[PDB]
Amino acid sequence: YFKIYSKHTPINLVRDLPQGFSALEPLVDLPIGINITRFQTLLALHRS
Amino acid sequence: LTGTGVLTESNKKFLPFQQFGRDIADTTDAVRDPQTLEILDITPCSFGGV
Ligand SMILES: *[C@@H]1O[C@H](CO)[C@@H](O)[C@H](O)[C@H]1NC(C)=O
Numbered sequence: 001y002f003k004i005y006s007k008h009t010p011i012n013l014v015r016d017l018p019q020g021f022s023a024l025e026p027l028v029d030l031p032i033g034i035n036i037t038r039f040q041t042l043l044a045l046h047r048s
Numbered sequence: 049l050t051g052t053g054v055l056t057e058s059n060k061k062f063l064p065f066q067q068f069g070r071d072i073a074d075t076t077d078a079v080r081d082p083q084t085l086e087i088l089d090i091t092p093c094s095f096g097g098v
């Protein structure tokens with residue numbers, strides 16, 4: 001089971017992690033049943 | 049989940065994921081009913097010493 005917990009926060013701090021507390025609600029539980037040891041973030045380019 | 053009690057209306061703001069509730073003893077104190085998704089409080093039936 002892949003448990004994904006999520007929390008969305010309106011902030012106005014410029015550079016770093018804001019200092020505070022916010023408990024993450026559970027978003028989804030996925031019955032994937034696979035071995036995971038490595039992960040990748042996916043980004044988007046901007047072209048002009 | 050089996051048990052005995054009176055099912056009453058409640059004012060506990062359950063979050064969407066949250067289904068049931070537990071007391072210190074871990075006995076269930078509130079439950080979310082299937083089919084209708086409402087939140088029913090479970091209050092033990094009246095008892096006491098004679
Ligand atoms: C999962 O992958 C890692 C690295 O490839 C390996 O060491 C581990 O034994 C694997 N686990 C299972 C259950 O296959």
Ligand SMILES: *[C@@H]1O[C@H](CO)[C@@H](O)[C@H](O)[C@H]1NC(C)=O
Nearest residue numbers: 067080081082083084085086
């Ligand atoms: C059946 O239960 C689901 C919850 O799993 C609910 O969304 C749906 O409205 C229920 N339908 C009826 C006819 O009770």
